[PDB]
Amino acid sequence: GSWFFKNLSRKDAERQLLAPGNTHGSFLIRESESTAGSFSLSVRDFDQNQGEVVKHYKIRNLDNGGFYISPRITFPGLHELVRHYTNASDGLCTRLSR
Amino acid sequence: EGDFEEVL
């Protein structure tokens, strides 16, 4: 749905996130066209040195079907993952928005 | 490697 995208390359994600209308925290979860079940989280944020940037985080998979960006905290699915980082940055560069 | 952000 709105935050989930299939087959979107790293650079397409970059163009989409950097478009006017997007703010810090704007983000999207993308699935690799080649390796099904392989997800990445792309976020818009501000770098003091760089300026507006798009960061990329690798979502890893558990053997039980679940996910995590940091072993510290795991989730049963992509929704729960979004609900958490949406509420706390918890390790990320900034909380997600929308 | 791709080059993903390091997290703690």
Q: Say whether B4 and A92 touch across the interface (CB within 8 A).
A: no
The DSSP H or E segment spanning A78 is: helix A78-87
Radius of gyration of chain A from Cα atoms? 13
Q: How many CB atoms are closer than 10 A to CB A13?
A: 21
CATH for A1-98, options being 3.40.50.2300, 2.60.120.380, 3.30.505.10, 3.30.479.30 = 3.30.505.10
CA A81 vs CA A34, A43, A45: distances in Å:
23, 14, 19
Entry resolution (Å): 2.2
| Phi, psi torsion values for A8, nearest 5 degrees | -85, 115
Alpha carbon distance A21, A64 (integer Å): 38
Q: How far apart are CA A45 and CA A59, in angstroms?
A: 18
Residue A67 β-bridge partners = A61, A75
Query: Is the alpha carbon torsion for A41, A42, A43, A47 positive or negative?
Result: positive
- Note which residues in 3-22 of chain A have CB less than 8 A from chain B: 10
Elucidation technique: X-ray
Residues shown for chain A: 98
Q: For chain B, which residues lie within 8 Å of any Cβ of chain A, measuring from their own Cβ?
A: 2-5, 7-8
